[PDB]
């Protein structure tokens, strides 16, 4: 499986892509 460093990077990336979703609405198919 992936490394501890790799899943830590992916947690920051997922939180940042949620921040981008609320800022820019480019993938806002949720509603």
């Amino acid at each position: 499986g992936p490394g501890s460093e790799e899943v830590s990077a992916m947690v920051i990336q997922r939180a940042f892509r949620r921040h981008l979703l609320q800022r820019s609405l480019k993938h806002a198919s949720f509603l």
């Binding site: 501890s4 460093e5 790799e6 830590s8 990077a9 920051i12 997922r14 939180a15 940042f16 981008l20």
Partner: protein
């Protein structure tokens, strides 16, 4: 996880079994709003009534232990949280200073995980590098990503 576990069920049984006043393995729909709040949560009357509509569909006015555990299984999720994001930065802060460099944040996003796009990286840099004055102030950047 996206679902409940035996070690969680073993604790929820102790609370549910105090409201099992009939001894049959059931609670009422009015005790549901007691037991979920006595477990330290605080859902609304509307959220409680919507979870009742999902189990009182038979019209019996009662809830079996596994039907109550479906509500708890649906409440478990793998989604983001400040206590999860903060540890990822704390793992990368090998010096323990409470700050990292813009070079480290660029590297740990472009090399590790899936490789983040340069237009996403340069935005993640901008909003932290301005606030931490040439360093990344990750401790407050955790909040700016998930505040509501």
């Amino acid at each position: 996880a996206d679902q409940l576990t035996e070690e969680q069920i073993a604790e929820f049984k102790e609370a549910f079994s105090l409201f099992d006043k009939d001894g049959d393995g059931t609670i009422t729909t009015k005790e549901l709003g007691t037991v979920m709040r006595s477990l330290g949560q605080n859902p609304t009357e509307a959220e409680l009534q919507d979870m009742i509509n999902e189990v009182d569909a038979d019209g019996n006015g009662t809830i079996d232990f596994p039907e109550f555990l479906t509500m708890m299984a649906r409440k478990m999720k793998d989604t983001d949280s400040e206590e999860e994001i903060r540890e990822a930065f704390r793992v990368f802060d090998k010096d323990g200073n409470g700050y990292i460099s813009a070079a480290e944040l660029r590297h740990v996003m472009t090399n590790l995980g899936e490789k983040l796009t340069d237009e996403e990286v340069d935005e993640m840099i901008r909003e932290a590098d301005i606030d931490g004055d040439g360093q990344v102030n990750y401790e407050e950047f955790v909040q700016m990503m998930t505040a509501k």
